[model samples]
Target: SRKLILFIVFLALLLDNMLLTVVVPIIPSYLYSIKHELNENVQVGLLFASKATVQLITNPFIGLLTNRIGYPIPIFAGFCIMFVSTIMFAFSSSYAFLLIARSLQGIGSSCSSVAGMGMLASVYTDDEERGNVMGIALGGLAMGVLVGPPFGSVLYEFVGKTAPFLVLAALVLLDGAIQLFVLQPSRVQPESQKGTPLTTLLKDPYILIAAGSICFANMGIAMLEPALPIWMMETMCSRKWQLGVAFLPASISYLIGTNIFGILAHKMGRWLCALLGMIIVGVSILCIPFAKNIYGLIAPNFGVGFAIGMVDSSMMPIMGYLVDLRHVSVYGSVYAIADVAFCMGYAIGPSAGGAIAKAIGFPWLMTIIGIIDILFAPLCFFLRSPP
Candidate 1:
């Protein structure tokens, strides 16, 4: 029975990760596809940000929706949103259409992000085993992170640009089926606090800090996304295969970090892991501007994947502090704040990078921003103190 439940949860996680990766690596390419030379990167960043923007406003409401209406409605609704978005993305030609499609996709993703995890947290009986179970479930995320670039690039090469979105749509549809038929409804919590103002959730200090870390982590990573691929295209000798080469090393490094380093963090200490990981990520981001060749870029990017894995592996487990197990719906909403911040970073970073690079070059842009990332490490120090 445990095995069956684990499999079902992992399946959902896999679909989620697949959708995330599908969009990240390919979205820039699609944006470029629409307006060949118009500073679309900035616009693309806004499009990415729009998802988070809407999510910020709607997350609490969705949480309440989960409490009152039950998980099935929201879960299934998220799937429907994802399906329509992916379908729209597959054929979108204009920048506005892409924006609308991506926004819808973001909504569904935001909803599923908290709801699915909340469901698992509710179901898992033992705190001791939660780490391993989450690790296994997030293995799909690791796969998406590791494989998304190269795999999507490969599809772009062989099947045409639209193929990835079509694949994404098909997979999300399959996920909806599994969710509808296989998943059980989580027990509903009493809705006495439904009338409370959303501002009250800010009372939890852990939620604030966790959301801060998630925002910083996401922004730090998002800052790299559009820039990294463009960096590879410029730095590498072979422009045609740069995506394959860069993502290959990155993927291998990420797998080692997620699987091997993750276990070590659990044994050594979650706090130490979080601290070291954030510091390393800061250093790596600072180093990006100094990279002169493919190898230089590859090494730092790989370190980023490793360090973030350590931080994320540790911090996600600690989120149980934000809300009680029965209030998983509330937990889901609070969790969306982190995601909304992440998307904001994505929206803000890339276009900003273009401007910075235009003004001072990529190195200065990376060096200055990397310093900002380092500042966030001190927040982790405060997190170490007892609540």
Candidate 2:
């Protein structure tokens, strides 16, 4: 029962990946279908950014509330919001309604994401076990990336846009129901020696810097979400499957990277692995500017995914170490701050990338983004203290 509960918690991460990626392929078509009144590229950025914005403001408070009130309440409320918003999204006809539904979806996601991490971390004792559990959670996350977008696009082709939204809504509700009915609060003991206030989490300079690094990493990643299809459409030109082709390598690389980094963090230690990951990520982003052809695109993306694996594997453990076990929700809040930054980055990335691609061309824009990401490692220096 205990092991099964952990698996169920891990499975909840699928909701996270699906919420972000499911809309990517459809956005362009939807923009064209709406007679170009709205820009599909910009919508991707807006969707990602808005979720982060709402979460940035609410995640900490929600984390505290989850600790006080217990997991079931937040999980229940989150699903209710997600299911309703998702249904509304299926029926939406205008940009206004679409934004409204998406905003609510963001709120629902925030509730689940912060609470889910808190729940999972609360249950595990050893750092190695935590790393393994996090890997499993990320495995579900990878599955969502591997399966969600194409599945959404396929559903859109057959049953229309409404189908994916409705299906996602149902899945979220079902996941929430499983959590509520089958899972109980974990009985794991505390690991950390410090007993800091929740407020200290938001205020600590080290944590703040770590949070900032996470934000930049997220922004770097956000560059791909909308830019991939737009880049393909511009570069490959008149090709129907260009978007799918462009995204495939990155998805596979990320899944592989996660598994690899999960084990490496456990064996080699977290901080050193994270530093190496940052360098790899920096190189990967810098290479984006050179991607003129398909291999150019795929290669750099794979590198970035591998680097991201290091960061995810390493940072999660550090977050656990930094906080008192009773304040796992606070650690989740720090993670949520990164989520908000990612949303902001995504919200801005599409139109910014589009404008750059339009003005200086795709290659130059990629170069600029690469430079931005490469600078993040030096920033991470301030976040880390020598052991």
Candidate 3:
């Protein structure tokens, strides 16, 4: 039963990430289909930004709601919304409809993501166990990122636009059924600490610093989302699949980093792992503007992905410790703050990068963001000692 719940949570997070990224490889084709006339960079940025914007508001509330209720309900609710959103994406007729669909998708993502983390925190009490579990669970997320774009592109080009989303919808249905039937409907509570109040948890100095650290880490990576595809197309004369291929190194490296660094964080300290990860990410970002070809880009991109894995693998388990320190019951709310910090990065990064790229250029924008990433490395020192 324990293993079963763990697997389900993994599936939930995997689906969340896959759903988030599935659109990336198909964005150019979709926009062409819609006869879009706006600046492609700004438009693509909006597509990514819209989802993060919704997540920004919904993630915290979803966390609170999950804590108040239980896991299954929110998990189920998320799938329902994702199911509808997939259908909307499949049948979207206009850019406006796509925006609405993506926004709804974000809400669903927030629901599953927060609830799944809460469930994991509730079940895994041992710090080491929790770290390992998080590494495994988030590996699913990394896998989704690895597979989603190319898979969507393949289905879109060979099969059809509707085929990829329809297939995802079926998977969502299967996940829901498994959650409903195979898993027990029990909520796990901490044995001792009930956890701090939501207000206090939000105000905790440690949580704030952790949130800032995570936000910058995410921002560093997200800046590429809108810019990279266009950059590849313009500079390398790349095709759609090549764009997807560019991300392959990052996703693969991220998976490796997550598993290795997750254990290291437990053995050493999360702060040490986090600080090193930030430095790695900063160096990777600094290298992006210098890449002249696909081959040149792969190494730096892989570094960024690996760095993200190290940061996330360490940061998340630390957040779990906080949940235990506060109270297991507030896992939803506590994790929610982390989610907010994450979504804020996703929200701000691409949007700002797009505008900056439009105004100046991609190289300059990368340079500026790269410096910011390095500057962020010092903030990890302020992260409070995890319980």
Candidate 4:
């Protein structure tokens, strides 16, 4: 049953992330098709921002809903919402419609994520088990991100605009059905087991530090997404395939790091693991823009992915430990903060990257992001050792 539950959580997280990114490769080209009708770049930027903004607005509410209603309802509802949103995105012809679809998708993502993380926390009470399963679930997330953009591009090229989204919709529906039929309600904790209030939880210095680390690490990563392809095209004269290839090493290393780093954190201690991860990520980012050739970029990209994975994988378990130490059942709220941190990164990173790159250059942009990541290292000193 535990294994089955883990599988369900993995599927939910995988779908959430996959559906989130599946639109990335499609958006720019899709905008081009309608270029004469709209402001292409601004609309594209809005489309990306719409999702994160909605997720940011909705996450805490979803977390509260998860805490109030338990897991099944919100999880199932999230899938259903995603199903609708994907179908809308498949046929969306106007900019307004696209923004609406993306916003709805963001709400769906929050619902699924809060409920899913809640279930994992509920099911895996043991610290080690929680860390391991979190790693596995995060691995699913990495896989989705790895596969989504390329698959979206391929599907768009071979089939049509609607096909990729329709397929995703079908997947969402299928997953929803499985959750409705196969998954059981998570074992409930008593009202007495409820942890600190959301207000107090936010006030924790430890949690603030952890959340900051997540924000900076993910921001450092998000800073690259929009600019990297442009950089690749200009610097390496990369074709579409080569553009995809540049991201492959990082994604592969991310998968490996997610699977291993949680356990390492569990053994070596979370703060130490996170600090070391940041150091690696900082150095890797600093190296990226200096690379003159594609080959030189791969190693830094791989290091960035691996180290970011280490930071991400370690942080959640640390959050779990903090929740346990507080004797609360606030997984929903805690993970919501984590999600917000992540979204903030996505929301800010690319925009900042674009602006900074335009003003100074890509190398300086990377250098600044690298320094930011390094600065986050000292903040880990504020994390309490896991009990």
Candidate 5:
């Protein structure tokens, strides 16, 4: 039962990110082909931002609501919304339609994002193995992030634009089907397993540091989603498929990092692992603009993804641990706060990233942000606890 839940929850969460990033390689070129006179990067940025921003608004509320209700319905509902959103993305010719579809996608994501993990937090009661469980679960997320771009690009290049998303919608259907069958309505929380209040959790320095670190970590990677593609085209004259596949290394690296850190979290410190990832990621982000060719780009990108794995894998289980340590073992609100942080980072990335890059250029922007992450590394000391 535990193994099945872990895998299925992986599927439920996989689509959340897969759908969000599927457009990365496809849209920038699509917009350019439309012959739009304005900075299409900004438009691309918002498309990505729109997905995360709405989730940011809805995440906390969803967290609160899911805690009150149950998880299955929300997870099922998310699949339905993803189905519609993908179809809309497939058929829509106008920019406004795409924007609306992406926003709808974000709303649906709020359901799956919180509920999927919430389900697991309740099921996986043993802290000793929880880190490994979350690491494996996160692989679903890792797979989506890695697969979406290349999956969309290859399909768009070969199978046609409508084919790619239509296929995704079909996947959503299957997920819903699997969800309906696998999960029985057995989940209910004990009254004693209450968590910290959202307002109080907001004030805790440890919680905020976890939130802030994830924000910046994802920000570094997400910021590149919009800005990097255009630069790649201009700098190395990359093809769509080439651009899409280029991200494969980072995703794979991320998978490895998460697995190692998570499985070994018993021996190594989660806080230290996160801080080390920050330094590595900071250096990687700093090196991004300096790349003169695709080869150079690959290294920094790999570094970023691997380090993302470190930060994400380390911090996620910390949510559960924090609740157990400080309050009740309730996962909903705590995960919700973390989800809000994830949404907040992603929202800022493309939205502000494009404009900021356009103003100061990608090199200067990455350089400064890199320095900021390096600065952020030492703050992890505050989050550490004595065994």
Candidate 6:
């Protein structure tokens, strides 16, 4: 069943993102458990940033790998790498091995992120249908990210230090088996298929804007990821429960936006949905601080999540469309660009945003980012024309 193909993609992404966070909660646990201290902040930053850096560096190579071989090769290899690294993480009693495990997962995840979408573009050649599966596949990503922290810490405290990853490792093995059997549809990239040059594609306005939009799609959340919890406690004097509940709306809202945009992005126009999503993200972000209280805050949080989700559904398929319209069908390079866009924003946003948020208040930072997003919307419309 092609259902397995979709399931495999979905499950891989779910694990891909889940692996990003599953290590998070366990970090502190391991840190304190082994007599650690204030330097721990540096350790945490190194751990997180290492994945982003490694993935960014390896993206082009993965892109090349995708173009040279069938998608299943990279996809299954990523699964195997992740499986090995998960076991590495499970046994990691040293920071050195732990960091290595996390860093290694980044390469695996880069493979999965770029090639997984590359396979979808190859198989689901129709634009609307591609968006539909992308929408659905991305939901696994959304769910994994949301589920990972709880999945990590809960399993650690209740079961074992190794429980979360062991479970995830086994799941990875199962998906690997399924994918091995189902196999990717043999994608025959013929002889004489030189991909569109990176410099050419990078210079293209639409591609750059699309990449920027993907970056902004991630930046809003990334900025808030560190900033908001701190903001809430200081101002609202929020309890742990209140802080937890405050962000809960975003997950449900993101899922709704995915399903909604999946159906509607094609109908309304893929590019247009991106334009609106950017506008809404701006507005919602601007509203976050103005709302002032938790109950009042939920609305904008919900809006930001939904708007970002809208961009996810809309822009992903549009990448494929642009590849078809303007270049050859080799998707690895473009999705690699998109993957880098995502990583850059995520890697930089929190660190850069944290500094700027601290230097100038977050409200002003929010206002500025919101204004830029709204202003950025018009450029998207210009891309609607034939290249």
RMSD of each: 4.0, 4.1, 3.2, 2.6, 3.0, 2.3
Model 4 lDDT tens row, 60-91? 88777766667787887888888998898888
**For each candidate, what is the lDDT?**
0.65, 0.67, 0.80, 0.83, 0.81, 0.83
**Least accurate stretch of 10 residues (summed lDDT) in model 5?**
185-194
**Candidate 1 TM-score, C-alpha based:** 0.81
For all predicted structures, in order, the TM-scores are 0.81, 0.83, 0.88, 0.93, 0.89, 0.94
lDDT of 4 at 201: 85
Q: Which pairs of residues collide in candidate 6? A: none
Q: Residue 306 lDDT in model 4? A: 92
Backbone clash total, candidate 3: 3
Look at candidate 4 and tell me the lDDT of residue 60: 84
Question: What is candidate 3's lDDT per residue for 257-298, written digit by digit as tens?
Answer: 877887777877888888988898888888887877888998
Residue 238, model 5: Cα distance from true site in angstroms: 6.7
lDDT of 6 by residue, 61-142 (tens): 8887777775777887898899999999888878899789888999999998888888887788887789889999888878
Count of residue pairs whose backbone atoms collide, per candidate = 0, 5, 3, 2, 0, 0
- Once superposed on the true structure, which residue ranges of model 3 sit more than 4 Å away at CA? 36-44, 184-195, 229-244, 326-329, 384-387
Ten residues in a row with the worst lDDT in model 3? Answer: 187-196
Q: Please report, as a residue range, the 10-residue window in candidate 6 with the lowest summed lDDT.
A: 36-45
Error of 1 at 14 (Å): 3.6
Q: Would you give me the overall lDDT of model 6?
A: 0.83
Q: How many collisions between residues are there in candidate 5?
A: 0
